[PDB]
Design an enzyme around this catalytic site. Structure first.
Site, PDB file in Angstrom:
ATOM      1  N   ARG A  73     -24.417  14.144 -74.276  1.00  0.00           N
ATOM      2  CA  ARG A  73     -25.551  13.744 -73.741  1.00  0.00           C
ATOM      3  C   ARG A  73     -25.986  14.994 -72.602  1.00  0.00           C
ATOM      4  O   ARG A  73     -25.237  15.900 -72.332  1.00  0.00           O
ATOM      5  CB  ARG A  73     -25.143  12.754 -72.658  1.00  0.00           C
ATOM      6  N   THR A 133     -22.811  16.296 -70.415  1.00  0.00           N
ATOM      7  CA  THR A 133     -21.770  15.526 -70.487  1.00  0.00           C
ATOM      8  C   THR A 133     -21.328  15.631 -72.138  1.00  0.00           C
ATOM      9  O   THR A 133     -22.194  15.329 -72.810  1.00  0.00           O
ATOM     10  CB  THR A 133     -21.895  14.295 -69.635  1.00  0.00           C
ATOM     11  N   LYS A 193     -17.665  16.385 -68.144  1.00  0.00           N
ATOM     12  CA  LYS A 193     -18.690  17.200 -67.755  1.00  0.00           C
ATOM     13  C   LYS A 193     -18.487  18.718 -68.285  1.00  0.00           C
ATOM     14  O   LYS A 193     -17.500  19.466 -68.587  1.00  0.00           O
ATOM     15  CB  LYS A 193     -18.754  17.560 -66.327  1.00  0.00           C
ATOM     16  N   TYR A 211     -24.523  12.406 -61.349  1.00  0.00           N
ATOM     17  CA  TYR A 211     -23.977  11.741 -62.317  1.00  0.00           C
ATOM     18  C   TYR A 211     -24.282  10.420 -62.758  1.00  0.00           C
ATOM     19  O   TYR A 211     -24.993  10.008 -63.559  1.00  0.00           O
ATOM     20  CB  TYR A 211     -22.863  12.156 -62.693  1.00  0.00           C
TER      21      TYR A 211
END
Length: 219
Positions: A34, A46, A95, A104
């Site tokens: 992501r 992430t 992460k 986040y």
């Protein structure tokens, strides 16, 4: 019994894990990356991995045994059974680049509130639950390699856990006791309105082999 480990930018997702919290064992359903489609270059922020409790195979086998990966991927009802099945799901976000907790959690909570509004279940109880969700993240920072664990219980509870690495914490940081919210997070990942389909593909690819077994047993 062919379920394998997945690595996402040096972040390893083992094929099977056992929760120190619940004592239950899970298998890796899928994993991907992501980030943001910003500044012309795709920047990974992430990694995500979705784990299903081992009993999920027996539960899903009745309806989905014998179906192909191509067919499962195109069937919404399959992912609804995964999202809302009578078994624990465990999501691990790792992460790649450093993010604070509020940084986040911002986009994650946006999608959840959006979903809960879409399906008409965003009242006071759910807004408060999402508030308790936000608060859990505020005092935390996530250096590279640090993880957040979402434990979705079928009993309508969402447990949040934070780890400095990829291993599961013994204690959970918070318990969001709300049915609608408990399933909201996973919905944003593999639900109908999920933006990235990489996890949907992963699940479609990996489950048919397991479903033929009729059940999943660690060891």
């Amino acid at each position: 019994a062919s379920i394998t480990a997945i690595t996402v930018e040096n972040l390893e997702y083992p094929a099977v894990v056992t929760s120190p919290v619940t004592g239950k064992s899970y298998f890796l359903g899928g994993a991907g990356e992501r980030g943001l489609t910003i500044e012309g270059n795709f920047i990974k922020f992430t990694a995500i991995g979705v784990y299903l409790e081992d009993i999920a195979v027996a539960s899903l086998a009745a309806k989905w045994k014998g179906k192909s990966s191509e067919e499962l991927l195109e069937t919404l009802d399959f992912y609804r059974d995964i999202i809302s099945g009578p078994f624990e799901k465990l999501i691990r976000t790792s992460k790649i680049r450093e993010l604070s907790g509020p940084e986040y959690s911002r986009k994650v909570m946006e999608n959840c509130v959006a979903h809960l509004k879409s399906v008409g279940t965003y009242g006071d109880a759910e807004a408060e639950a999402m508030q308790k969700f936000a608060e859990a993240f505020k005092p935390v920072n996530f250096p590279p390699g640090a993880s957040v664990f979402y434990r979705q219980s079928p009993d309508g509870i969402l447990g949040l856990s934070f780890s400095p690495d990829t291993s599961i914490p013994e204690k959970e940081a918070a318990l969001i006791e709300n049915k609608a919210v408990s399933s909201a997070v996973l919905e944003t990942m593999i639900g109908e309105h999920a933006v990235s389909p990489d996890l949907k593909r992963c699940l479609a690819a990996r489950l048919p082999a397991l479903l033929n077994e009729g059940a999943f047993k660690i060891g």
